[PDB]
Amino acid sequence: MPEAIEVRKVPLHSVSDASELAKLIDDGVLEADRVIAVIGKTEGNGGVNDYTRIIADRAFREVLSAKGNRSPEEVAEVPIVWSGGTDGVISPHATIFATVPADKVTKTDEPRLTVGVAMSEQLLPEDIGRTAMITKVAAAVKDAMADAGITDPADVHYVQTKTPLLTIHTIRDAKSRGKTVWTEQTHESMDLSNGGTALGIAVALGEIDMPTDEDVMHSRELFSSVASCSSGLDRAQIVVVGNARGVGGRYRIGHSVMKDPLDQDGIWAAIRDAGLELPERPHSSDLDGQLVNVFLKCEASQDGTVRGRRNAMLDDSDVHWHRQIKSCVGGVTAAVTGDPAVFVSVSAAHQGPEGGGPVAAIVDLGQ
Amino acid sequence: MPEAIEVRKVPLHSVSDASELAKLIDDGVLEADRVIAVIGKTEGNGGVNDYTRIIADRAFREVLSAKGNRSPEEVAEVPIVWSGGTDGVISPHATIFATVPADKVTKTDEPRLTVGVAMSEQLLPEDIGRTAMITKVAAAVKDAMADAGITDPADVHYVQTKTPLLTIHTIRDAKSRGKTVWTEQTHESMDLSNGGTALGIAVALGEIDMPTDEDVMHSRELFSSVASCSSGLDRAQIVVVGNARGVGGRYRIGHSVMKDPLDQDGIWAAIRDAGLELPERPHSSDLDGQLVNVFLKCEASQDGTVRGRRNAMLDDSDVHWHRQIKSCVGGVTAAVTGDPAVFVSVSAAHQGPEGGGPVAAIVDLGQ
Amino acid sequence: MPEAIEVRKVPLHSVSDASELAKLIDDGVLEADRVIAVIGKTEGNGGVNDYTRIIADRAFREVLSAKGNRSPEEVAEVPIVWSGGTDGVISPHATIFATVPADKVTKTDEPRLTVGVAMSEQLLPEDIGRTAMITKVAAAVKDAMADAGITDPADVHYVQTKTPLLTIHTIRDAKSRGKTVWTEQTHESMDLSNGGTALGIAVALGEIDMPTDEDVMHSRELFSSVASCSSGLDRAQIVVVGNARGVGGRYRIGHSVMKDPLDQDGIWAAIRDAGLELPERPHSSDLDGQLVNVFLKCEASQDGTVRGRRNAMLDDSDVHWHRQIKSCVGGVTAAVTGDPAVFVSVSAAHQGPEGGGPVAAIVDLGQ
Amino acid sequence: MPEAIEVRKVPLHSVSDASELAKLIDDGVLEADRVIAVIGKTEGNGGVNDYTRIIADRAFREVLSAKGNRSPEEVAEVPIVWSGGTDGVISPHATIFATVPADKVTKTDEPRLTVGVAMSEQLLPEDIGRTAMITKVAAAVKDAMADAGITDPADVHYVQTKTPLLTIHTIRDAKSRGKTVWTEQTHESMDLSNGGTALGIAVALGEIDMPTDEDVMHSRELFSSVASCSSGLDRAQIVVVGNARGVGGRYRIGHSVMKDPLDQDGIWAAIRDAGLELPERPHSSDLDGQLVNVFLKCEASQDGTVRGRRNAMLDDSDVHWHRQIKSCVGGVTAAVTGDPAVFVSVSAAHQGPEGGGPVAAIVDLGQ
Ligand SMILES: Oc1nc(O)nc(O)n1
Ligand SMILES: Oc1nc(O)nc(O)n1
Ligand SMILES: Oc1nc(O)nc(O)n1
Ligand SMILES: Oc1nc(O)nc(O)n1
Ligand SMILES: [Cl-]
Ligand SMILES: [Cl-]
Ligand SMILES: [Cl-]
Ligand SMILES: [Cl-]
Ligand SMILES: [Cl-]
Ligand SMILES: [Cl-]
Ligand SMILES: [Cl-]
Ligand SMILES: [Cl-]
Ligand SMILES: [Cl-]
Numbered sequence A, B, C, D: 001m002p003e004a005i006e007v008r009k010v011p012l013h014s015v016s017d018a019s020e021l022a023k024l025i026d027d028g029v030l031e032a033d034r035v036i037a038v039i040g041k042t043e044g045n046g047g048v049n050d051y052t053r054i055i056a057d058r059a060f061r062e063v064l065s066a067k068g069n070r071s072p073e074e075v076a077e078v079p080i081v082w083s084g085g086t087d088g089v090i091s092p093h094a095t096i097f098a099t100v101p102a103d104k105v106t107k108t109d110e111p112r113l114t115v116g117v118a119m120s121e122q123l124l125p126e127d128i129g130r131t132a133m134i135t136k137v138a139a140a141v142k143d144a145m146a147d148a149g150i151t152d153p154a155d156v157h158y159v160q161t162k163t164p165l166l167t168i169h170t171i172r173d174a175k176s177r178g179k180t181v182w183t184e185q186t187h188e189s190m191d192l193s194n195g196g197t198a199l200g201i202a203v204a205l206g207e208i209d210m211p212t213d214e215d216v217m218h219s220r221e222l223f224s225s226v227a228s229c230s231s232g233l234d235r236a237q238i239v240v241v242g243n244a245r246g247v248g249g250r251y252r253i254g255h256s257v258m259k260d261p262l263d264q265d266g267i268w269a270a271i272r273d274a275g276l277e278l279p280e281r282p283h284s285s286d287l288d289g290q291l292v293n294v295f296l297k298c299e300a301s302q303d304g305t306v307r308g309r310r311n312a313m314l315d316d317s318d319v320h321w322h323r324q325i326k327s328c329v330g331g332v333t334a335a336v337t338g339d340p341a342v343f344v345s346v347s348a349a350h351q352g353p354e355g356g357g358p359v360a361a362i363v364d365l366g367q
């Protein structure tokens, strides 16, 4: 059964800092054993050789193990997703999701935040980017969606995932058994792994019909409107975030789409959808501390243009467009929220329309 | 005497493309010999080894020479400033400034756009970053300010400059005569050259008292509110842009300040100051094609924070913060204008407050 | 008929410098109209957005047009290959190949340098990286090989090429006609274009049997021992360099293979093969100004190891391994020649064994 | 009293791998509590935001604490220097230094390896790069030199150090007390901290007279021939490595200088100086497993040339010359040793002549 959720966004003061999580536990805001998911941004390069993700992961799991009754083995099964790369003003942070004990919940028929978690069946190197990944992910998303107590896909607003990369060893693992892989460049496998996962989410939620192998990274009109996929277990980790009626709690999630890197109105639409009443032309000062965080994807479009204007992102061998567009949308987004602590993630194949991406917002509607 | 000004922003379709300038001349929008200044963004890395600036410079001067009566020598004296680096959505473009023949001008008492140009006395390597650069720049700014027909410094809204770097040869040139230089790193000399130039502008316009050598790059509370300095002649090139009454024309300039990288309200204040009436909470769709361009500076603050949130820009050895903050503010700015063709420049020592910078806007008020 | 060849390596003093070529012509070392090929290194980033290649190309073709009777159209057909990226000590330079007038040649039965040039049939975006590119290249290599007066493939020591990339427009050009492309990442298309071209050279010279599409970038045991391919016309440009008996001249070419990035003995083997007698353990001081240049390829092996030791090149999202291994092998090679002006090129799929590449040497055997 | 030393170079299989150290302890090669120093290369970017250094540091200290009787506090005082950045073929590794118990030592009058350690007095931000750092370092080097049982500075072959950087907090710490700092760019403070430390070593060992503040980073003819300084405690950590007679052991150290990035003969001179007899023109195959490691510094010269040839390292805003020259000299060095596991460090102000650096070699002379 779905439980009421407490959500807290905390800053990371350094690469290995989990002190703010420790403080939340100490002050009784949440119990260590009730942390069911963490979604954060780390200050690494955001690519393959980003070791800030494991540094934060160790620091956070050490807190959870030290202050709870869970074993390191049980703590190790908590989904924690670290999206590296905080280019520009983006501030390293972690959004903590925890269940609320029944004696602190006020049950209500209003839609309130609920979280579902699942793990897919083993992802083979040869599956990555193909229909095998799509079917296995789609099944796991259906699992997590049911685990959240959500029956209507329209009540799912945000599916944050984690999927593996193709490495030198897994690439051999395929060739040992005879098989081919989609790509042998590990950096490109990042975009591929997120894309194939996104297609699985879109299928599970009924946003698209089952695609074919030749659609992956090619048919960019096929996408999920709630998928936020990251890489890079030998299995897709799934975190479904939506709303359920009759659970209680003070937070609510909504979403929309950023049609391109400058679509601030899409971000405001997400915040409105989450339940915050805002003016017709809102401004960051209207939020009054009620926006916990936003979670969105961005990408450089394959046509090399934004609103009719050419940019040179796709030809830049000096600074990969991953970093360029992340910094850009980081500013666009933080300008809306007024808080540089925003979850902005790059590599958005099949996640929102080309050149854009989904955007979810969590707001505090409680007293 | 100040003349009425025609202003046109055109895209660059490639690194060597000046076809849009050629088209403006062919269609009679402006005469080649009346082009007095060009200010543009090029798609290079924006650092020391950025050769897109010279490629655009050659392409543009070839057009001016081919379609005018001016010799290549006279064309060579036209101030053309190319700010490299178009990280993110920023679109390569050039803003062309031209005088209008008297038989096409409607004289008016309303403030309208006027441009003044000057060259300072020779800048010695040992001057760069010291009071020598400040005094020589301040004198040239007073020259250009008078050349624009501007007597009140409050009527100066935008001073775009070009100053040299410290190179292996000029560094010897100093040591040959005995002298020391401020830095021997050419990449750092970029920030220094712009900073010392900015202090000169601030002195000339009476924004600050004459500083000392130890203030340069250190006393960041001393700044000009209209300086936009770029590098990197052995002389400061100065382009003063302001308004004059009784000249006529259809364009007007205004300015404000971006207090930090997310200060969109500062950009809107510049547009309002330029003469466009806008709603209380404006949006890009209110502009109705009346905003020609904005010109602004950005920088990562030395305290490493934006609105109380830590970022890791100053410690990033992978992608210099020059590129990170440029992409970020590029998005913030283009979100306001709705046009990725924006003049966003990085390296803003003594140009606006720390972590921010000046922002000027040119609007079309004509029929 | 093959003509005797004069070969001169000159430095570039700046990005746009062709003064050393101009000096060679002025001093009567060579005639402008007799320049048949130029192969050089430019100081750009060596990737997609490297504009130092076109800057050098324009500067060099302007010299050839200005000092010869050839029209700009005829000069435009001279194969000039600029390999960008001079990471580390590699010094920007150009190797100039020119025919010698008959009244300056001493015919000899000794093997002496000869150059052959050809152009393949149009390369379609959909051909790139597939058997279509391989067959079209193989035919052009047979053309250039015959144009050099070479009948035995063992007399071909160095085939320098130029092939196009997959761009946003050509990718559409395929999809407009229905077709698929190998990759849509332009940076990766560099490695693909060179690889498919290398396979064509290997087929033409009988080094391999005709491969299949699934071999390209995958069967790295299939390679040419003389191919040096660069990108990125809509056609493979081919420059075959070998030896012919009975032509005369003072230069001779030889080659071997660099088995890995540290294989200096492979470079020395190339110099020995070119005709220079050297000690058993040679050193750079044994060359006595008789080595004109070396031309070689390098790459990071897919197994991520060099001589049993792991390196992290393939996982580095900060500095692409293209640049890392180029700088590394630049030092290894310049340590052998004693001259930082070495032609070191990266991206070596099907060019020498995995982790290595071919290496050719041109020596001056004349009085 | 100096003790006999056991030296072992082990690879790192991953960023957090200390298994090879654990194996050495388990097999009885060395005792955990007798490890007195570790000097290693890690696969990070080698700049300010390199977190592979702390990852390796934690992994290695955890082994030392787990397998010894030393407390984490005592283990924390063991000097461990991690030089990040393994550009090109350089393989991540750690050289472990341990004392040998008396019942395993064969005392000999031959010069054999000895290690001395010291800590300087507190380094103030305002000291960095000035005569204060030089005097405090010089005193600590004299301490470590005596701790190694070395009386003649000619018997010191290698002084590996660790010194702090200037950070946002320490820079305030100076300005709070009134003081100025040398630079406010943290990336540049790396080169400064190593330079000032190198001058201290040179003074202590009598290689130079006491310099002045204006010499630091400027008088590059003043240098130590054994200093290898890294950054970045609030104190200079010192590791002196030399030879002593009458101690016993099987290893010996020697050194020379690399006059420029291609000076392989300098590396061979170091190996010869260490006691290995080699041919006149040695080759890597002559080493027969007797070379434990080499330790050297490299840098791009301020004149921008190597052996009369221009390179573009100092103007490269895309890939800092730190990374370019490190990869280059990594290849040059590994070509000599035949082992990519080489200690190659960049940033060499006052460490060997300009454009070069010291090079030390440790060889195994035992049965
Ligand atoms: O670590 C990471 N960061 C981002 O922004 N995207 C991915 O796929 N991974
Ligand atoms: O070329 C250039 N671009 C920018 O943004 N800033 C400077 O100083 N130069
Ligand atoms: O321009 C260029 N340089 C190199 O080294 N390799 C390729 O394919 N292109
Ligand atoms: O971490 C590090 N690596 C190197 O090569 N040089 C310094 O100063 N620090
Ligand atoms: Cl409960
Ligand atoms: Cl509702
Ligand atoms: Cl309203
Ligand atoms: Cl007139
Ligand atoms: Cl008014
Ligand atoms: Cl209103
Ligand atoms: Cl003839
Ligand atoms: Cl022969
Ligand atoms: Cl011999």
Ligand SMILES: [Cl-]
Pocket (backbone or CB within 6 Å): D100, D101, D102, D103
């Ligand atoms: Cl003992």
Ligand SMILES: [Cl-]
Pocket (backbone or CB within 6 Å): D111
């Ligand atoms: Cl001896």
Ligand SMILES: [Cl-]
Pocket (backbone or CB within 6 Å): D278, D279, D280, D281
């Ligand atoms: Cl011998």
Ligand code: NA
Pocket (backbone or CB within 6 Å): A223, A299, A348, A349, A350, A351, A352, A353, A354, A355, A356, A357
């Ligand atoms: Na998308």
Ligand code: NA
Pocket (backbone or CB within 6 Å): B223, B299, B348, B349, B350, B351, B352, B353, B354, B355, B356, B357
């Ligand atoms: Na500023």
Ligand code: NA
Pocket (backbone or CB within 6 Å): C223, C299, C348, C349, C350, C351, C352, C353, C354, C355, C356, C357
């Ligand atoms: Na190869």
Ligand code: NA
Pocket (backbone or CB within 6 Å): D223, D299, D348, D349, D350, D351, D352, D353, D354, D355, D356, D357
């Ligand atoms: Na040095």
